Design a protein around this ligand. Structure first.
Ligand SMILES: [Cl-]
Lengths: 101, 97, 99
């Protein structure tokens, strides 16, 4: 009913399928390796861009501090100019008085 | 030829058990890969948001720079106008005696 | 023992079915992951170019900051000289109004 030869036939049949499965596994292993390599590189570049952006952001915060400080200085100078104006007018108007006399 | 059948069966059983074990390892490797990809996607979006915040702040700094530069030119102008008024007063006093 | 041999081969066949099902799912997921990584690479590069532009603008803001700082110091210098010139005229006018 079941000859050694029929069994042999099944074995060669199973062996042929396994050959195909193994070749497919080889193709997939290669794709997984390449993908791991791509991910590793993206990780590295992402960390690098994070560091670069970190430096920019740190400069930006300094620029914020600086802008606040310069504004404060401009306000102070403006204040000094207005005070001088009061003083100049005092001298101007007094000269008007003397000159007319 | 019973021996040759048993030998071949043994090799096949051996080979498929290895193939199965390998497939399991590959399943595992791919799920680890999915996790790593999900992680980089997440970190990229976070960095994108962080940069967007920085770029937003930078535009404000541009705006603030324009305003300050205008204020400085204006204060300069006032100072020059006062210079002229002071010179007139100096000249007049030198002349008043 | 032919049936015991065929039983072992039936089990081998079931294992092959399971591996092949897994291989199909693995191929579907692998293509998806490869697409996802490609998208990450592209978006990362875009973010890098965008940051490059931001970094350039910041370097310009730094020079603007230096420039304006220099102008404020020059203006303040003139305000201080004018203060001395005004004091000069003030003190003399007060002198003249004495006696
Ligand atoms: Cl006078």
């Amino acid at each position: 009913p079941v000859s050694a030869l029929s069994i042999l036939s099944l074995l060669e049949r199973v062996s042929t399928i396994i050959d195909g499965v193994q070749a497919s596994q080889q193709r997939m292993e290669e794709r997984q390796q390449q993908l791991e390599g791509s991910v590793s590189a993206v990780q590295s570049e992402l960390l690098k861009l994070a560091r670069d952006h970190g430096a920019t952001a740190t400069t930006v915060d300094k620029l914020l501090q600086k802008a606040r400080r310069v504004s404060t200085h401009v306000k102070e100078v403006r204040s000094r100019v207005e005070k001088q104006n009061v003083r100049v007018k005092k001298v101007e108007t007094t000269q008007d008085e003397l000159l007319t006399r």
